[PDB]
């Protein structure tokens, strides 16, 4: 499993001169039942954006295993695919938590705060929580479960560093 990084431009042709309306980068990461995409668009003639994407074969909130699960995987932002995701979900207690470590920018290595495991509008198991650095809230994260045994998790997080919000992709698998 590798993170694929891409550069891209969207161009139009006007008077026989290709013109770039926007440019950017995106990283994609595939596991067995899920995929995540971060994406950064710049308008090359409200300026830059963070678009994320998340999808796969969602786990049904009414079909979760008993007990507890441990997950391990990757965290990635723009240039940085080195992050490491750790996460635990207690299914009996409808609760999850975890952390991000080893992104080159220290302030992106955030706790994924304890958060409730609930059902989304399609009755899929999901977790929405805060990101933390120290004891200060710094953003939110959105985690969905994937696979019929909830083998996988994937989603994304957001961190405010200075006055710029960063956006991190996160995906993991159960240890065995």
């Amino acid at each position, epitope marked *: 499993d590798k993170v694929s990084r891409f550069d891209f431009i969207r161009q139009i042709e006007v008077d026989g001169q290709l013109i770039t309306l926007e440019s950017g980068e995106f990283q994609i990461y595939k596991q067995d039942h899920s995929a995540v995409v971060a994406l950064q668009i710049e308008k090359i003639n409200q300026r830059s954006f963070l678009v994320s994407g998340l999808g796969g074969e969602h786990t049904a909130f009414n079909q979760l295993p*008993d007990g507890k699960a441990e997950y391990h995987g990757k965290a990635f932002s723009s240039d940085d695919a080195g992050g490491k995701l750790t996460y635990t979900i207690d299914f*009996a207690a409808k*609760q999850g938590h975890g952390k991000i470590e080893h992104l080159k920018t220290p302030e992106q290595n955030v706790e994924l*705060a*304890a*958060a409730e495991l609930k059902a989304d509008e399609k009755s899929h198991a999901v977790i929405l*929580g805060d990101t933390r650095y120290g004891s200060e809230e710094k953003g939110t994260y959105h985690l969905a479960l994937f696979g019929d045994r909830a083998q996988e998790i994937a989603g994304s997080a957001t961190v405010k560093i200075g006055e710029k919000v960063h956006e991190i992709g996160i995906a993991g698998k159960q240890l065995e």
Partner: antibody
Amino acid sequence: AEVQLVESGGNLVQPGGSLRLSCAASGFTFSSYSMNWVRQAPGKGLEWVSYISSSSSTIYYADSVKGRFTISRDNAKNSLYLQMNSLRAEDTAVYYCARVAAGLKDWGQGTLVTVSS
Amino acid sequence: EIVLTQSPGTLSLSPGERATLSCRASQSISSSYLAWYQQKPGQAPRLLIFGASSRATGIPDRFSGSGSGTGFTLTISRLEPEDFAVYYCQHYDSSLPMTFGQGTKVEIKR
């Protein structure tokens, strides 16, 4: 489509008697959540009573009631129950039904049990 | 076994002031499984903090929790009047019978 819990069954019973509490749940897929009984004697703190998991594979009882009470649930009728026997005076309390959801997030209003001759 | 001891018994503070409540565990516990509840006369308990430091749905931001190991803390930054109540901590690890602390009362000092 909000969550609700409604205990019933509370009542007067003589010491050594027996009483069966009920809890009707709506607003969520009852068969997906662990539930608890918690009780409060008059003017006293909360005392956790018993726990049971979604599927009934895991049950706990407080030291104070281990023996005399039995928890169970019927997912078809979206109901939780608490069978009490050998009731003593110290079991006089309000009995709450509660849903485990990143903590005890949803509580019914309670049913009052009095145990007295 | 796990016993939860709260302190102090009564906290007397004026509105606006900062309130700091303590929950001590007899053994080390996972921070995942310490919760705080609020209770007012005639009402069912209400979940304030779950997972040691996460606020329950719809819970104002002035309630924060912290701690680890055997020592946990519930902080109310500015005490509104609807905040004077009884507060309980609870261990709810799903692999163990649960337990409540004996609770603390934050009364209005005048």
